[PDB]
Write a new protein. Structure first.
Length: 129
């Protein structure tokens, strides 16, 4: 059931974004960076597509993800901004790498990746039909 499936992976995404918020070090990605208060004034000169857990929660609450991959793309964007801005040996970069690993392993345990595969196959059915 295509609508039933949409409900399923929305529930998985909500559970996963919550697990990230509570994983060790998750708080530094919960909200968009306040550049002046965190002593990083150049942050938005470098990061032109900012993203945080709270942004993703808002898009989930508003039904703004159409496909399972779009949620993963937004979470991955957090980790890419983290590794771009912070040097590889910094606490923040290490923390971001650790949470990234967790997220990708949750995609496996929760079976979220199966929904991304079904999303691609449906897109191929439609392209034939
Ligand atoms: C995504 C990110 N979060 C936080 C942060 C936020 C709240 C408290 C603390 N302690 C750190 C940072 C960050 C960066 O990569 C840019 C450098 C600033 C640090």
């Amino acid at each position: 059931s295509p609508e039933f499936m949409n409900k399923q992976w929305y529930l998985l995404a909500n559970q996963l974004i919550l697990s990230l918020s509570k994983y060790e070090g998750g708080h530094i990605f919960e909200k968009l960076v306040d550049a002046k208060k965190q002593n990083c004034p150049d942050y938005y000169d470098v990061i032109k597509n900012p993203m945080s857990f709270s942004c993703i929660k808002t898009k989930l609450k508003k039904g703004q993800y159409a496909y399972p991959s779009e949620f993963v793309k937004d979470v991955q964007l957090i980790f890419d901004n983290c590794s771009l801005y912070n040097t590889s040996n910094s606490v923040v970069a290490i923390t971001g790498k650790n949470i990234e690993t967790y997220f990708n392993n949750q995609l496996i345990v929760m079976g979220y990746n199966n929904f991304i595969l079904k999303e691609k196959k449906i897109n191929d059915m439609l392209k034939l039909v």
